[PDB]
């Protein structure tokens, strides 16, 4: 493991496999797709997710009054990955700390209560990255927070895997599909988009595009904060290669994620320590 | 001269941003809290309240300028 189950609590080990699909030996309706390129045009929409499909799918609360502010992940059974500018954002007055908010885990649906399913829970402990560039790009727009308690797997609640230098090199390139997930419809919709080469991206805006991110989708003619992850056909285990940061929806849309293994050593220092 | 390898070398004196941030000591507590849990190189030399590029930042040399997350700045340097 790469990371001390002392600090980072369990998890690790079975990370990325969910218990309704690959623990089944079964596939989600559409992830065939990250294998297979269309070019007949189909307009690229989120659609509603299968129950089940993206069990560290994560929704960060206003405490008070209850307000849905951002999308995170769940990465053990007690740490949870966001963006930092889902806490902090100065020039909006924007400063959360742990008591101001709360986490829903486990849920399908966005407005009701699901009994059996999902569970809430308090922080302890938030962590932004010490040079989150909220003055100039979002560079390293990157959160960490510690969950009070530990909260219990199920069938619905489970971690999703952490790249590490190997997996990142094999899966984070060009061409290559992510599935990004977030919040008219009522369930998580999901949606599957490419990475797009960096001299793109940066051809798109003119914001300074850094290492630290990597952009997806398709040129112009949200979810901020959840996950872009790609499913190893090495290890058949979901990895979260990024973190949506600003920019994934069907007129034409380029999505910046944080560039998770760029961060990982931050998370490990952070995480072997609290 | 210009600077090469994005300031990765620099041992100037350059003590404030490009926007007149001064710049905060390396050694001051509230610099080394935010540098802490980062991955710098010990290489490059933090002295007094210097411009430098400890973490390979693509973009250049840069300094605290307060104590909270995000409160640095880059400082205006001529690169290669």
Same mark, same amino acid.
């Given at each position: 493991?790469?990371?001390?189950?002392?600090?980072?609590? %369990?998890?690790?080990?079975?990370?990325?496999? +969910?218990?309704?699909?690959? /623990? /089944?030996?079964?596939?989600? /309706?559409?992830? +065939?797709?990250?294998?297979?390129?269309?070019?007949?045009?189909?307009?690229?929409?989120?659609?509603?997710?299968? $129950?089940?499909?993206?069990?560290?799918?994560?929704?960060?609360?206003?405490?008070?009054?209850?307000?849905?502010?951002?999308?995170?992940?769940?990465?053990?059974? +007690?740490?949870?990955?966001?963006?930092?500018?889902?806490?902090?954002?100065?020039?909006?007055?924007?400063?959360? !700390?742990?008591?101001?908010?709360?986490?829903?885990?486990?849920?399908?649906?966005?407005?009701?209560?699901?009994?059996?399913?999902?569970?809430?829970?308090?922080?302890?402990? $938030?962590?932004?990255?010490?040079?989150?560039?909220?003055r100039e790009?979002?560079?390293?727009?990157?959160?960490?927070?510690?969950?009070?308690?530990?909260?219990?797997? %199920?069938?619905?609640?489970?971690?999703?895997?952490?790249?590490?230098?190997?997996?990142?090199?094999?899966?984070?390139?060009? #061409?290559?599909? #992510?599935?990004?997930?977030?919040?008219?419809?009522?369930?998580?919709?999901?949606?599957?988009?490419?990475?797009?080469?960096?001299?793109?991206?940066?051809? %798109? !805006?003119? $914001?300074?595009? !850094?290492?630290?991110?990597?952009?997806?989708?398709?040129?112009?003619? #949200?979810?901020?904060?959840?996950?872009?992850?790609?499913?190893?056909?090495?290890?058949?285990?979901?990895?979260?290669?990024?973190?949506?940061?600003? #920019?994934?929806?069907?007129?034409?849309?380029?999505?910046?994620?944080?560039?998770?293994?760029?961060?990982? /050593?931050?998370?490990?220092?952070?995480?072997?320590?609290? | 001269?210009?600077?090469?390898?994005?300031?990765?070398?620099?041992?100037?004196?350059?003590?404030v941003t490009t926007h007149g941030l001064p710049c905060?000591?390396?050694?001051?507590?509230?610099?080394?809290?935010?540098?802490?849990?980062?991955?710098?190189?010990?290489?490059?030399?933090?002295?007094?309240?210097?411009?430098?590029?400890?973490?390979?930042? *693509? *973009?250049?040399?840069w300094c &605290?300028v307060?104590?909270?997350?995000?409160?640095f700045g880059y400082c205006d340097?001529? &690169?290669?």
């Amino acid at each position: 493991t790469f990371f001390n189950p002392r600090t980072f609590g %369990s998890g690790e080990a079975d990370c990325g496999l +969910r218990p309704l699909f690959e /623990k /089944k030996s079964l596939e989600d /309706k559409t992830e +065939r797709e990250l294998l297979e390129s269309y070019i007949d045009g189909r307009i690229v929409e989120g659609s509603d997710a299968e $129950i089940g499909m993206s069990p560290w799918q994560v929704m960060l609360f206003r405490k008070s009054p209850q307000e849905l502010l951002c999308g995170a992940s769940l990465i053990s059974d +007690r740490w949870v990955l966001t963006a930092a500018h889902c806490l902090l954002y100065p020039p909006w007055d924007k400063n959360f !700390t742990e008591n101001d908010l709360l986490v829903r885990i486990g849920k399908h649906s966005r407005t009701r209560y699901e009994r059996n399913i999902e569970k809430i829970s308090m922080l302890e402990k $938030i962590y932004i990255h010490p040079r989150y560039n909220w003055r100039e790009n979002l560079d390293r727009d990157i959160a960490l927070m510690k969950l009070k308690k530990p909260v219990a797997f %199920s069938d619905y609640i489970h971690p999703v895997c952490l790249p590490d230098r190997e997996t990142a090199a094999s899966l984070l390139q060009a #061409g290559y599909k #992510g599935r990004v997930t977030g919040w008219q419809p009522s369930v998580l919709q999901v949606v599957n988009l490419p990475i797009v080469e960096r001299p793109v991206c940066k051809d %798109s !805006t003119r $914001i300074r595009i !850094t290492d630290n991110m990597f952009c997806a989708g398709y040129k112009p003619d #949200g979810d901020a904060g959840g996950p872009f992850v790609m499913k190893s056909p090495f290890n058949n285990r979901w990895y979260q290669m990024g973190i949506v940061s600003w #920019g994934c929806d069907r007129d034409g849309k380029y999505g910046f994620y944080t560039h998770v293994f760029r961060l990982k /050593k931050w998370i490990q220092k952070v995480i072997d320590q609290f | 001269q210009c600077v090469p390898d994005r300031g990765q070398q620099y041992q100037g004196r350059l003590a404030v941003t490009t926007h007149g941030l001064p710049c905060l000591a390396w050694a001051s507590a509230q610099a080394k809290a935010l540098s802490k849990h980062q991955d710098f190189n010990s290489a490059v030399q933090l002295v007094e309240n210097f411009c430098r590029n400890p973490d390979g930042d *693509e *973009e250049g040399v840069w300094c &605290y300028v307060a104590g909270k997350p995000g409160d640095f700045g880059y400082c205006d340097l001529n &690169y290669c």
